[PDB]
PDB file of C-alpha atoms in Angstrom:
ATOM      1  CA  UNK A   1      49.205  19.116  69.186  1.00  0.00           C
ATOM      2  CA  UNK A   2      50.799  21.923  67.188  1.00  0.00           C
ATOM      3  CA  UNK A   3      52.836  22.961  70.234  1.00  0.00           C
ATOM      4  CA  UNK A   4      53.848  19.382  71.068  1.00  0.00           C
ATOM      5  CA  UNK A   5      55.543  18.823  67.697  1.00  0.00           C
ATOM      6  CA  UNK A   6      57.747  21.938  67.552  1.00  0.00           C
ATOM      7  CA  UNK A   7      61.529  21.609  67.354  1.00  0.00           C
ATOM      8  CA  UNK A   8      64.557  23.926  67.121  1.00  0.00           C
ATOM      9  CA  UNK A   9      64.728  23.368  63.362  1.00  0.00           C
ATOM     10  CA  UNK A  10      61.252  24.882  62.813  1.00  0.00           C
ATOM     11  CA  UNK A  11      60.393  27.021  65.855  1.00  0.00           C
ATOM     12  CA  UNK A  12      62.108  29.143  68.492  1.00  0.00           C
ATOM     13  CA  UNK A  13      60.924  29.155  72.110  1.00  0.00           C
ATOM     14  CA  UNK A  14      60.592  32.659  73.601  1.00  0.00           C
ATOM     15  CA  UNK A  15      62.203  33.171  76.984  1.00  0.00           C
ATOM     16  CA  UNK A  16      58.874  34.136  78.554  1.00  0.00           C
ATOM     17  CA  UNK A  17      57.230  30.883  77.437  1.00  0.00           C
ATOM     18  CA  UNK A  18      60.114  28.990  78.994  1.00  0.00           C
ATOM     19  CA  UNK A  19      59.805  30.991  82.212  1.00  0.00           C
ATOM     20  CA  UNK A  20      56.023  30.756  82.605  1.00  0.00           C
ATOM     21  CA  UNK A  21      55.335  27.214  81.437  1.00  0.00           C
ATOM     22  CA  UNK A  22      58.443  25.630  82.988  1.00  0.00           C
ATOM     23  CA  UNK A  23      58.465  27.367  86.399  1.00  0.00           C
ATOM     24  CA  UNK A  24      55.282  29.193  87.369  1.00  0.00           C
ATOM     25  CA  UNK A  25      52.291  27.262  86.025  1.00  0.00           C
ATOM     26  CA  UNK A  26      53.754  23.776  86.694  1.00  0.00           C
ATOM     27  CA  UNK A  27      54.369  24.749  90.324  1.00  0.00           C
ATOM     28  CA  UNK A  28      50.871  26.227  90.605  1.00  0.00           C
ATOM     29  CA  UNK A  29      49.245  23.043  89.243  1.00  0.00           C
ATOM     30  CA  UNK A  30      51.144  20.751  91.663  1.00  0.00           C
ATOM     31  CA  UNK A  31      53.168  19.099  88.881  1.00  0.00           C
ATOM     32  CA  UNK A  32      56.953  19.198  89.257  1.00  0.00           C
ATOM     33  CA  UNK A  33      59.574  18.300  86.678  1.00  0.00           C
ATOM     34  CA  UNK A  34      62.170  15.572  87.420  1.00  0.00           C
TER      35      UNK A  34
ATOM     36  CA  UNK B   1      62.680  30.041  59.746  1.00  0.00           C
ATOM     37  CA  UNK B   2      65.169  29.455  62.603  1.00  0.00           C
ATOM     38  CA  UNK B   3      67.925  27.936  60.442  1.00  0.00           C
ATOM     39  CA  UNK B   4      70.138  27.576  63.514  1.00  0.00           C
ATOM     40  CA  UNK B   5      72.115  24.815  61.768  1.00  0.00           C
TER      41      UNK B   5
END
């Protein structure tokens, strides 16, 4: 829940989080973004 | 704080 409610005005997303959780894990769990 | 804007 804490992660779900973050925004640019309060938090910054590290590049490694973006990489992992938007490419690697989603592809490994058989869920693909639009 | 980001404070981007």
